[PDB]
Amino acid sequence: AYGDGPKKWGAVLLPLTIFGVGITAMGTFVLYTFSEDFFWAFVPGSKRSMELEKKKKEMAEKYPSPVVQHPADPLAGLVNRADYEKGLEEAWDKVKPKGSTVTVEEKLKELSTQNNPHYWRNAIKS
Amino acid sequence: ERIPGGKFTKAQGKIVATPDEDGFTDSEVALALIIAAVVLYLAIEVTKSLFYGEDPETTAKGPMTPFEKRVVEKGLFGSRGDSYSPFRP
Amino acid sequence: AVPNTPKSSPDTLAGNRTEASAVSRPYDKFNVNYPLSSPDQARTEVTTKEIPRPEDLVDSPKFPLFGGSANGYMSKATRERHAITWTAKEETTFEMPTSGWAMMNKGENLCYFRKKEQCIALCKQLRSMKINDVKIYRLSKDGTVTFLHPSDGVFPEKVNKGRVPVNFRPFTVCQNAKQGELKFTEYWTKPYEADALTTLFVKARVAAYNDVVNLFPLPNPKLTSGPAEPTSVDYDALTKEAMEGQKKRIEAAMASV
Amino acid sequence: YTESAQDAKLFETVFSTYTAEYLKGPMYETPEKMIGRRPFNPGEPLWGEDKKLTSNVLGPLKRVSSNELAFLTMICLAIGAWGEAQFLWFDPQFAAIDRGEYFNPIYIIAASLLPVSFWAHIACYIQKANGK
Amino acid sequence: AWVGPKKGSQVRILRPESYWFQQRGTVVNVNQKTNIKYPVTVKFDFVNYANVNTNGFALWEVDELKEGEYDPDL
Amino acid sequence: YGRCATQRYFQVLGNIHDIELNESLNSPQAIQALSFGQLSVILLWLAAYTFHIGWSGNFEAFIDNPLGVQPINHFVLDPHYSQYKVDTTIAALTNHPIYHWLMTVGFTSNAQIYRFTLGLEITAAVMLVLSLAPSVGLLSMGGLEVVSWISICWAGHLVNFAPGAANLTNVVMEGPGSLGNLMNVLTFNGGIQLGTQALAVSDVAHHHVAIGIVGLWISALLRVSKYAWNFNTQSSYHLDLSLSLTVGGILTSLLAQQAYVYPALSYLPYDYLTTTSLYVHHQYIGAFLATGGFVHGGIFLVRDYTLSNDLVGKLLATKATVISTLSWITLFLGFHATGLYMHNDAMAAFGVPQKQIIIEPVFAEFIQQVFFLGTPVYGLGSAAVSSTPTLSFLPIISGGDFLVHHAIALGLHTTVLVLIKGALDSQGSYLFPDKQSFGYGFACDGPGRGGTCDISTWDSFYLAFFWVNNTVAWFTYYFHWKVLSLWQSSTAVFDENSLYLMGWFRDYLWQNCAALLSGYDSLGSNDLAVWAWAFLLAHLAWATGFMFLISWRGYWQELIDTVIYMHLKAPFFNEIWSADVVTPVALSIVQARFIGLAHYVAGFILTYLAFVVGATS
Amino acid sequence: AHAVKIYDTCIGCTLCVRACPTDVIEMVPATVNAAKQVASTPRVEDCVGCKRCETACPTDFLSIRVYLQENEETQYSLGLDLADWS
Ligand code: CLA
Ligand code: CLA
Ligand code: CLA
Ligand code: CLA
Ligand SMILES: CC1=C(/C=C/C(C)=C/C=C/C(C)=C/C=C/C=C(C)/C=C/C=C(C)/C=C/C2=C(C)CCCC2(C)C)C(C)(C)CCC1
Ligand SMILES: CC1=C(/C=C/C(C)=C/C=C/C(C)=C/C=C/C=C(C)/C=C/C=C(C)/C=C/C2=C(C)CCCC2(C)C)C(C)(C)CCC1
Ligand SMILES: CC1=C(C/C=C(\C)CCC[C@H](C)CCC[C@H](C)CCCC(C)C)C(=O)c2ccccc2C1=O
Ligand code: SF4
Ligand code: SF4
């Protein structure tokens, strides 16, 4: 008949598909909450994410890419950072206020250094 | 038998004609379930692939195909950029 | 009592609170010098003998005249405690940070709280009532005591020597780099954590990008396995003329300033 | 020498100006500067210091003379206007479809050349302004 | 010698983020110390969202205006 | 483990698909893989519909008598039904034009539907396989050329299954032949073809082949325009996503309009409920897509844009002008539409309906008469009558439609005002000069500076989504009442009572709810009982959204703290739960605002769906 | 831990120090303002994010900025009273 079919298949599956599947999904999500990889990609400093970052760095330093990539350090893009600073030094000496005692490398060290211990990647003793 | 609700169902007199038989029997339903099981297995594979992300060695240890090499070199098909854009050109 | 409080010890109920916080919240860590700002800042050390954990004190003479309340910390459900040690000149009434009222002792006083905010609120109240030497301590699960609030002995409202500036950014608030400028860097979502050098560099980089009359084409990589394409443009001559243009542009720019 | 705060600001300005003038050249090597992203394509600068388009903006026909492009755009305009007029009003082609007969391919091919004439005359003026 | 805007002279604020940006304010005092990064103390008739109308500005963030070269109607 | 708070759930789940923040699969190949997985989900959803239509459905009985039979969606097997309700219900009826679509595209049997379900499952498997292997090679797939090729292939399918394909002489083997031979499968008749009361399948096939060829040509032209003037200066996933979302929203809204006025599915206009549901659903989807385009534009401004002298820089520099002029437009439109509606309300209330301000929509009437209508209906602009007119379902406008269109303009302009204002102030306002360093979404900047509630750029979308829903409600009320009057042949109750808003209440909402509320009562329950129940459920969800929007966190955080105190002080449970595991904390401010908006719009959608079903049943 | 920063515009008010309910801000000597003192935040781990320090800063805009980081909530940042994670 018309009713038969979906009746038997439903009596088998609808209890399964709703009860068993949804309850298993809820229980597995609660387990995933207590799992070590709980939202690992969105929790800063998580073990899986940090290991992935380390392995990405290892692959980048072991298999150099012929194409140029976005520099993680914006100053790391420079093909010759030495020449960059040497020019800065020459320009600064050209426009130094009188016999100023301030040099370019000290200023670059002062600007690059920063005391932000509470920023992560620094709270992980890194 | 249904109790009609709504002015247009009564006015137009449309009847819900139940088919005499079912329509898909039971064997073809089983085949659909089998194909859906294969699709479910593929979905589990995709979920495992996406949750753990792309490993760093692939796309770094596996050399790009000559198509991919030339596309990245010439900047085609969304390369030379930082977008997906399926409707590119 | 078993119905009043759980029969098991606070450590038993805690389970693995540690070794799970290190997993659940790997970002939650204290810097190497938590109460202070510089490593060479005395770092006075106190132990459980000086400020014992509250479960080891019953009817202590240093407790104020407090009648107990439901608003205190969770014994056996929390293990972290914050303690205040202040000395009074006379016995007067004060508001507990957890509501209710207590009366201070004539001499030494000692209170225990869960959050440091309660201790700081009580310290503000006491200092408003002309009370010095309000020392605030933190009690850990294992009993290690960390001295806080007047960490270097001088209250933070008064400037004191030996205090290195922390989280000081040498520019104005809106002189931080924009997120788009810091894209693909570790400071993309947190431009306020970038260095002054990095912020200046990216703010100059965005200006450099907007000068395509002098921007360099940056030739394509050679990825294909075949022979190099002969093309029709000499990259060497372009590089030489770009060196000349860069030199002259830098000279003119430095002449301007 | 008791560096002034204004001296520190002067150094910041010098650093910013030097960086800005230095990263333009081939000494920074960032993905943005890759051909087809921000730069002007190697040997084909589109415009100079003045914002005047160069002949390189035309692409394959970057050396077709101004006179030839003028002839091309005028012929395309005339042929496209003839095709459009012969398709819409004079001997209409939709009415021909209503008669059961097919379109006349000549009219469609002719009318296809009007946007050709548009871009051709724009390119013609670009060439003329560049002296080509 | 005196450096910076004259006391009591109207200045236009060049700090992009200031609540009184491109507006006009009266200089109260300029700290004649080279180490002060924001010596120019400017008072404004309008108060910002913090209900404060006095702020210090750097020497390069203020444009001294002559007695009649600005717009009296703001 | 799991020594986090419940805030972790709503913090990560709000960015769980913000893959740019997911450093693992951050590459564009992963995003294409996500697209493949989404398309697999879409294919499985369509397979669901086709499978339940072919399994327990009357498509074989539908093709025979498309006017006299009601399409069946799926078989109902709810254990909670009472024998009577079981005897009462036959099966879950159909509220979508899938029967009409299958009939149009040549389905004539349940065997074809079953093969279609198998093909959909296999194609979903193919999509999952493609998602298994993200790769720059797969990034080549796609493009306007690909979608135009899909259009060409769909044209081929429709040609193969056109009703006149039987009379078609094989063109590729016996030559093109006479023009009528091609007219068997490729026509440009234009408009409704009578009978099926829908566009001919030949028209649709011809449309698709033309669109595919033109799209191939346009893609080639765009790529040669990329040959010279090759400048990808601003590439961002959010910029391209905003482009795609805005174009998709325009296309979906156009789909709603042109599918009501030019139905392409056979015997669709005879089914009133499916037509109304189609229009409402597609308009909601289009509005959502446009709002998403604006949202992703704002996101691109927040975290992917670098200030330049470009188009966006020019927009940002004069953002005050844009916001001020949009505010003026919205103020004018709202003032005048509301005032005219209130004036009409007062005149109708005071027994003087003649003294209402009925501004005739003479401009839209002029457009309609001059460009669309083939007979003199209004007589302004033109009065010529077409010798050979074509048929369609374009409504005839009247005085009320002027005010309704001004309400629509007010809603659209206010939504655009909120979205543009938020996107352009993501770069900073004088209350928040450094919004470029705070991200797209954040709670506030505290009570200082007078207060900074809802100052985030995400809060701009949060505020503008109410306006999106309100505008869609306004013009969907317009469409629904217009088509209800047309189908009920009133066409004068609408044209008179839509001038004043008490008409919009009494004759539209109160009037069309009579049958829906009688879905179940003391006498019994009929087929509309499910929709009355869904009506109530949607109202409940809407008011829960009210809870999450009105009451804010601090109260609830203190209340949850007291509840935690009760749990930790409760017997038999302090030994088991120390609140250390998944600490129960109140929803964050952004999370609370989003959840309140979600309940609000869920109740909105379900309420209007139930009302549409109960009114057009 | 909600990151809190101090900028050059600080003028040594000490109001931000007095407004902090958890002793995050701290007054260090400096040579950038007439007060010869500048706020610092060496105990950001105690910052709840209440932004009382921003309410008390008199500069044109906030010389002290509290950047909420909802993805890095802490029992000290969340102000937990009945749940311990240490
Ligand atoms: C969007 C997908 C979808 C949905 C919502 C439903 C809904 C329903 N189906 Mg169903 N079905 C579907 C697809 C779907 N079907 C497909 C593709 C098949 C072919 C294999 C079937 C075959 C099928 C049978 C044979 C039966 C049902 C039945 C039912 C009903 C009870 C639920 C149940 O037991 O499901 C069981 C369904 C399956 C075991 C098939 C798996 C469903 C597909 C393949 C998964 C799709 C997932 C989708 C992409 C979303 C994933 C994301 C999600 C986590 C949010 C309910 C009306 C039962 C019924 O009518 O009883 C009253 C019943 O007997 N369905
Ligand atoms: C193809 C289109 C598309 C794509 C790819 C994206 C992609 C993205 N969007 Mg986006 N968006 C889109 C369309 C799109 N959007 C549209 C159309 C709108 C307007 C409505 C928005 C509005 C929007 C906002 C406002 C935000 C994003 C954000 C994001 C990013 C993070 C997504 C995330 O984790 O959300 C998480 C997703 C969810 C939490 C899903 C919610 C689950 C729903 C509500 C369930 C409720 C339905 C329920 C079953 C009904 C029950 C009924 C009841 C009666 C029982 C991501 C890049 C975020 C971002 O980039 O911020 C940095 C962000 O804040 N989007
Ligand atoms: C009925 C409810 C309602 C009403 C009337 C408004 C009205 C308005 N909202 Mg609004 N809003 C609402 C609900 C409502 N909102 C909700 C629930 C949300 C979700 C949080 C929003 C979110 C929201 C945002 C995010 C924005 C608005 C904006 C606006 C203004 C748009 C300009 C306009 O139409 O001016 C017309 C004003 C009215 C119709 C108000 C009534 C005025 C009188 C009573 C009617 C006219 C009478 C007569 C002509 C005057 C007599 C004059 C003389 C004889 C005395 C306007 C004041 C925008 C804005 O302010 O831009 C300017 C804006 O950005 N609203
Ligand atoms: C910002 C103002 C504004 C906006 C957004 C709209 C929007 C709309 N109007 Mg509209 N309208 C307006 C003001 C406005 N109107 C005014 C002031 C009048 C005079 C009473 C009308 C009279 C009017 C008619 C008669 C019709 C529309 C219609 C429409 C809709 C279709 C588009 C159209 O016809 O453009 C019309 C747009 C304009 C004419 C531009 C007006 C914009 C100016 C700047 C506003 C101020 C005008 C000023 C007061 C005139 C002073 C005159 C004086 C110097 C002699 C659209 C929703 C049509 C409709 O309802 O479709 C169903 C229609 O037929 N409008
Ligand atoms: C269909 C389908 C699907 C879906 C699935 C799902 C979605 C599931 C879910 C499920 C679920 C989600 C479930 C849930 C459940 C729940 C329950 C089962 C509960 C119960 C409870 C009870 C029974 C009790 C109640 C009560 C109380 C508690 C109080 C008040 C009163 C009362 C008594 C009522 C998919 C697409 C995937 C695929 C396949 C098909
Ligand atoms: C936020 C932002 C953004 C975004 C934006 C957007 C989102 C936009 C959109 C836009 C859009 C979305 C547009 C659209 C357009 C459309 C059009 C332009 C159309 C037109 C048409 C017409 C005009 C026609 C009409 C008509 C008809 C058809 C009928 C009636 C009559 C008439 C003729 C009137 C960005 C980042 C990017 C930038 C910055 C800011
Ligand atoms: C009611 C209310 C709450 C309390 C609501 C909460 C805490 C969420 C309710 C949770 C529901 C009841 C589900 C509880 C958990 C279920 C067992 C499901 C668990 C699912 C997880 C395992 C993923 C707020 O936190 C809040 C915050 C800010 C503004 C307004 C409000 C507000 O109105
Ligand atoms: S209130 Fe502001 S200006 Fe004053 S000391 Fe604190 S941070 Fe500096
Ligand atoms: S937000 Fe509150 S707790 Fe954090 S530093 Fe500012 S005043 Fe202190």
- DSSP states of B28-58: HHHHHHHHHHHHHHHHHHHHHHHHT---SST
The closest of C230, F380, F39, C252 to B39, measured between CA atoms, is F39
- The answer to whether F436 and F426 are in contact (CB under 8 A) is yes
Strands G3-7, C168-169: pairing kind: parallel
F422 vs chain E: nearest CA distance in angstroms? 18
Q: How far E46 CA sits from the closest chain G CA (Å)?
A: 12
Residues of C in Cβ contact (< 8 Å) with G38: 165, 168
- Tell me the C-alpha distance between G46 and G51, whole Å: 13
CB distance from C9 to chain F under 8 Å? no
Distances from the Cα of B14 to the Cα of B5, B6, F87, G75, angstroms: 12, 12, 19, 64
| Cβ(F122) – ligand 1 distance below 6 Å | no
What DSSP line would sit under C37-83, residue for residue? Answer: SSSSS------TTTS--GGG-SS-TTS-B----TTS--BTTB--EEE
Nearest residue on chain A to D32, alpha-carbon basis? A70
| Beta strands at C168-169 and E10-13: parallel, antiparallel or unpaired | unpaired
Count of all residues that appear for chain D in the document: 132
Q: Are E25 and E40 in contact (CB under 8 A)?
A: no
Q: Which of D2, D6, D14 to mutate to test the interface with E (most CBs of E within 10 A)?
A: D6
Q: Are C40 and C107 in contact (CB under 8 A)?
A: no
Name which residue sits closest to atom 51 of ligand 2, judged by CA.
F602
User: Under an 8 A CB cutoff, do F230 and D36 touch?
Assistant: yes
Instruction: Say whether C23 and F307 touch across the interface (CB within 8 A).
Output: no
Residue pair C206/F306 in contact by the 8 Å Cβ criterion:
yes
Give CA angle at A27 (A26, A29), nearest 5°: 65
**Do the chains contact at B29 and A5, CB–CB below 8 Å?**
yes
CB proximity under 8 Å: F 487-526 to B: 487, 515, 518-519, 524-526
Q: What is the DSSP letter of F427?
A: T
Label residues C190-220 b or e (16+ Cβ within 10 Å = b): bbbbbbbbbbbbbbbbbbbbbebebbbbbbb
Show contacts of F529-535: CB within 8 Å, 24+ apart.
F529/F85, F531/F610, F531/F613, F531/F614, F532/F610, F532/F614, F534/F606, F534/F609, F534/F610, F535/F606, F535/F607, F535/F610, F535/F611, F535/F614
Interaxial angle between packed helices A81-94 and A104-112, expressed in degrees from 0 to 180 and rounded to the nearest 10: 120
Give residues (CB < 6 A) around ligand 7.
A 29-30; F 9, 547-548, 551-553, 556, 560, 586-587, 592
Instruction: Confirm if C204 and F306 have CB atoms less than 8 A apart.
Output: no
- Helix (H) / strand (E) element for E26: namely strand E24-30
Beta strands G3-7; C81-87: pairing state: unpaired
Residues F151/F214, Cβ–Cβ less than 8 Å: no
On whether the CB atoms of residues G44 and G24 are closer than 8 A, the answer is yes
A14 lines ligand 1 (CB under 6 A): yes
Q: Is D7 on the interface with A (CB under 8 A)?
A: yes
CB C214 within 8 Å of CB C245:
yes
Question: In angstroms, what CA-CA distances link A59 with A52, A64, A67, A72, F593?
Answer: 10, 8, 15, 15, 42
The CB density around residue E19, as the number of other CB atoms within 10 Å, is 22
- Cβ-Cβ contacts under 8 Å between C and E: the total is 5
**What secondary structure, in 3-state letters, does F437-486 show?**
HCCCCCCCCCCCCCCCCCCCHHHHHHHHHHHHHHHHHHHHHHHHHHHHHH
Q: Does A64 touch chain C (CB under 8 A)?
A: no
CB contact under 8 A, F448 and E50: yes
Nearest to G60 among E19, E31, E33 (CB): E19
- CA of F48 from ligand 1 middle (Å) equals 6
- In which element (H, E) is residue F423 found? helix F399-425
What's F297's DSSP letter?
Answer: H
First to last CA, chain E: 32
Residue B51 to residue F24: CA distance in whole angstroms: 9
Classify the C-alpha dihedral F365-F370-F372-F376 as positive or negative: positive
| H or E stretch covering E11 | strand E10-13
The residue to which tokens 């379109």 are assigned:
D103
How many angstroms separate the alpha carbon of residue F101 from the centre of ligand 2?
29
Q: Do F304 and C76 touch (CB under 8 A)?
A: no
Query: Chain F residues with CB inside 8 Å of B4's CB?
Result: 526-527
Strands F92-93 and F72-74: antiparallel
8 A C-beta contact, residue F469 and residue F415: no
Longest dimension (CA), chain B: 70
Smallest CA-to-CA distance from D30 within C216, A62, C242 is with C216
Q: What are phi and psi of C77, to 5 degrees?
A: -115, -25
**Residue F63 burial by CB count (10 A; 0-12/13-18/19+): exposed, middle or buried?**
middle
Which residue type, as a one-letter code, is found at position F507? D
How far is Cα F521 from Cα F580, in angstroms, rounded to an integer?
A: 49
Radius of gyration of chain G (CA): 13
Q: Which residues of D touch A88 (CB under 8 A)?
A: 14-15, 18
CA end-to-end distance (rounded Å), chain A: 71
Name the burial class of residue F223, with classes exposed (0-12), middle (13-18) and buried (19+) by CB atoms within 10 angstroms of its CB. Answer: middle
Closest CA to C110 of C74, C189, C56: C56
Q: F227 and chain D: CB distance < 8 Å anywhere?
A: yes
Residue pair F413/F407 in contact (Cβ under 8 Å)? The answer is: no
Which pair of tokens denotes residue C239? 């590089």
Tokens encoding F471? 């505008």
SS (H, E, C) D19-62: HHHHHCCCCCCCHHHCCCCCCCCCCCCCECCCCCECHHHHHHHC
CB contact under 8 A, G60 and E35: no
Nearest CA in chain C to D47: C213
Q: Do A78 and D27 touch (CB under 8 A)?
A: yes
Report CA dihedral (F553, F558, F562, F565) to the nearest 10 degrees. 100
Q: CA–CA separation, D61 vs D123, rounded Å?
A: 9
CA contacts within 13 A on the Cβ side of E34 = 8
Sign of CA dihedral D14, D20, D26, D32: positive
Angle at F348 between CA F347 and CA F354, to 5 degrees: 65
CA distances from C63 to C69, C103, C115, C119, F599 (A): 14, 10, 18, 15, 51
What residue type is C212 in one-letter code?
A: V
* 8 Å CB contact between E10 and E70: yes
d(CA F296, CA F236): 10
Nearest residue of chain E to residue G54 (CA atoms): E50
Per residue, the 3-state secondary structure of F148-214, as one string, reads HHHHHHHHHHHHHCCHHHCCCCCHHHHCCCCHHHHHCCCCCCCCECCCCCCCCHHHHHHHHHHHHHH
Neighbours of F320 (CB within 10 A): 11
Task: Spell out which residues of chain E touch residue D8, defining contact as CB-CB under 8 Å.
Answer: 37
Q: Beginning with the edge strand found earlier in the chain, give each strand of the sheet holding E24-30 in spatial order.
A: E54-57, E40-43, E24-30, E10-13, E62-64
Return d(Cα F504, Cα F351) in angstroms, integer.
17
What atom in ligand 8 is closest to the CA of residue G15?
1
Q: What is the per-residue burial (b if ≥16 Cβ within 10 Å, else e) of C104-127?
A: bbeeebbbbbbbbbbbbbbbeebe
Rounded distance, CA F520 to CA F85, Å? Answer: 11
Token pair listed for B68: 């991919």
Residue among E17, E55, E57 with most chain C CBs within 10 A, to mutate:
E17
Query: By the 8 A CB rule, do E57 and E40 touch?
Result: yes
Nearest to G71 among A42, A117, A118 (CB): A42
Do C20 and F3 count as a contact with CB atoms less than 8 A apart?
yes
Give the residues across from C84 on adjacent strands.
C111, C136
With contacts defined as CB-CB under 8 Å, which chain C residues touch F433? 173-174
Query: Does residue F206 line the site of ligand 4, with CB under 6 A?
Result: no
Residue showing tokens 């060497």: C236
Distance CA D28, CA D31 (A): 10
- How many residues are recorded in chain F? 617
Given 3-state DSSP classes, what are the helix, strand and coil percentages for chain G, each rounded to the nearest 5?
15, 20, 65
**Cα(G39)–Cα(G29) distance, rounded to whole angstroms?**
9
User: What is the SS3 assignment for F21-59?
Assistant: CCCCCCCHHHHHHHHHHHHHHHHHHHHHHHHHHHHCCCH
- Ligand 8 pocket test, candidate residues G41, G52, G57, most atoms within 8 A of CB: G57
Token pair, residue B64, equals 């790009």
Mutate to test the pocket of ligand 6, among F312, F326, F408, F468 (most ligand atoms within 8 A of CB): F312
For ligand 5, the distance from its centroid to the CA atom of residue E22, given in whole angstroms, is 61
Residue C227 phi, psi (nearest 5): -70, 155
In the block, which residue shows the tokens 């805030």? Answer: F7
